């Protein structure tokens, strides 16, 4: 049941992907650590909530 994932390697030694291993010891998900394998979304629902889609090169009002 081991989970193996990639580390995003910052400062490299003078020493190819580096991995780390994770095993969950408990039945309840709440006991689990934070994965940090998170997603990003587009800001549109906040930055552009207008009914008619905007084209930046075009006049906002027309």
């Amino acid at each position: 049941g081991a989970q193996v994932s990639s580390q995003k390697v910052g400062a490299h030694e003078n020493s190819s992907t580096i991995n780390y291993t994770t095993i969950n010891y408990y039945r309840d998900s709440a006991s689990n650590a934070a994965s940090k394998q998170d997603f990003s979304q587009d800001p549109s629902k906040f930055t552009e909530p207008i009914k008619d889609v905007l084209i930046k090169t075009a006049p906002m009002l027309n």
Partner: peptide, 5 residues
Amino acid sequence: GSSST
């Protein structure tokens, strides 16, 4: 066994 990612 090993679930890789």
